[PDB]
């Protein structure tokens, strides 16, 4: 890491370097700063309403609340020690604040302990199979806490129900509240009750003094919807002032990228939010704060070549930053069509090619 000649020696794994041009590393322009453009929505998400509502629903009839168009703080939930289970699948529990979700679905109910692990994708069991199902590709956080402090009234609380019998396995994210009498086999129910005509509906009857496994549990399942829809459930991160014509790290409604943001002549249709190239790379973005179209140009990069005569001849080297303007590069500096050449003196005279640099340009050790 001392000088370009040492980079050449380490690249070749040789203490002696022959005359020629050698690519040793890759110049990359680094981002000066990170800029954030989230939508200014001060309205807090109703996590307060869903986490300590007066009454939660039964598992067989799980209550779904749609969360959208609000700033969401998952840090306050993670910091609270009340929750016993905070299992996040497809997302990181710490990273939840930075993410922007197109939708959120909070599913609130009450279950027992022995089936807390039933609510997780690819699980089986009575509550898992006939009460609440999670798809294998489910993305979101299951948050369970013990609340027998206000769950089980003395003498048994039979308010919350569960469906222990059903015709078929519940479909993922599907609710079945039907109380049609189930025919288990030989004897047809004919729509009436009797022997082997097991009714789907069953009752908990939590006692305040049951085993911890048998005790009530309040569970909220947050499902994060991350389609190509616009991201509306964003974190509380402060939006920063927009910076143009400078290689920056940017965040536009959950689209993160490193690039130079320039004023775009592209005139998006009013519903359009992003732009893409023939290769489906992000080409243009729309500022959330002001309806401005911005071209995203990737930060200047390219190979670094070392023009050297043999270490027999000299330790002097020139450096070619390939396809880089002589402004991005951090005493002769000469702009060629092959890139920026530093440490080589431009000479008007034409000679036979010695070290081929690029588009008609060659280098040599002389005088």
């Amino acid at each position: 890491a001392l000088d370009p000649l040492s980079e050449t020696k380490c690249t070749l794994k040789s203490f002696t370097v022959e005359k020629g041009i050698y690519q040793t590393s890759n110049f990359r322009v680094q981002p000066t700063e990170s800029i954030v453009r989230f939508p200014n929505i001060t309205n807090l998400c109703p996590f307060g309403e869903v986490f300590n509502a007066t009454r939660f629903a039964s598992v067989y009839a799980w209550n779904r609340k749609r969360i959208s168009n609000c700033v969401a703080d998952y840090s306050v939930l993670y910091n609270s020690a009340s929750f016993s289970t905070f299992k996040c699948y497809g997302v990181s529990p710490t990273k939840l604040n930075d993410l922007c979700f197109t939708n959120v679905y909070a599913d609130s109910f009450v279950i027992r302990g022995d089936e807390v692990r039933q609510i997780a994708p690819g699980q089986t069991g009575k509550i898992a199979d006939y009460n609440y199902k999670l798809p294998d590709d489910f993305t979101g956080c299951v948050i369970a806490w013990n609340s027998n402090n206000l769950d089980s009234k003395v003498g048994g609380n039979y308010n919350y129900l569960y469906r222990l019998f059903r015709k078929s396995n519940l479909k993922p994210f599907e609710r079945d509240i039907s109380t049609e009498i189930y025919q288990a086999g030989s004897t047809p129910c004919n729509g009436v009750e009797g022997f082997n005509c097991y009714f789907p509906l069953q009752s908990y009857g939590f006692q305040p003094t049951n085993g911890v496994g048998y005790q009530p549990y309040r569970v909220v399942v947050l499902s994060f919807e991350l389609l190509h829809a616009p991201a509306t459930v964003c974190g509380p991160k402060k939006s920063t002032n927009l910076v143009k014509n400078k290689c920056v790290n940017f965040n536009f409604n959950g689209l993160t990228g490193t690039g130079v943001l320039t004023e775009s002549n592209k005139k998006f249709l009013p519903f359009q939010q992003f732009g893409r190239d023939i290769a489906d790379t992000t080409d243009a973005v729309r500022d959330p704060q002001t309806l401005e179209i911005l071209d995203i140009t990737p930060c200047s990069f390219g190979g670094v070549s070392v023009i050297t005569p043999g270490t027999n001849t000299s330790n002097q080297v020139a450096v070619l930053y390939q396809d880089v303007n002589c402004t991005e590069v951090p005493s002769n500096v000469f702009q060629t069509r092959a890139g920026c050449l530093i440490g080589a003196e431009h000479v008007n005279n034409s000679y036979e090619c010695d070290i081929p640099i690029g588009a008609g340009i060659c280098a040599s050790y002389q005088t």
């Epitope: 048994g156 039979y158 569960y162 222990l164 009714f199 509906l201 069953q202 009752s203 009857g205």
Partner: nanobody, 121 residues
Amino acid sequence: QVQLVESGGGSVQAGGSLTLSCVASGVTLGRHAIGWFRQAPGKERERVSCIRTFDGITSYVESTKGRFTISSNNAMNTVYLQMNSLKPEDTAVYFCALGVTAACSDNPYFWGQGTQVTVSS
């Protein structure tokens, strides 16, 4: 098929306490009304108590009110009958009784073996 395995009872002093346990297999408590019946000597079938496992409501008779407490823990598939303040008139064989209906009023169709409770004056 359904089994009603019973336990507890035996001999006890008049005014003492006992606990009867009934555990159901092949069925789950949670809707089916489960209760306790008894046979006193020279007496027919009579209800002692019942609990609606769908709602937890309990029904008794004149002879068993207050002295006997029925309680269903549907989670362990268990029903308990606690005798307190026993009398020699309570010397009876107790049957665990189950229905295919939510109502305790409906006659049980589903019987356990039976446990003898003897009360000594």
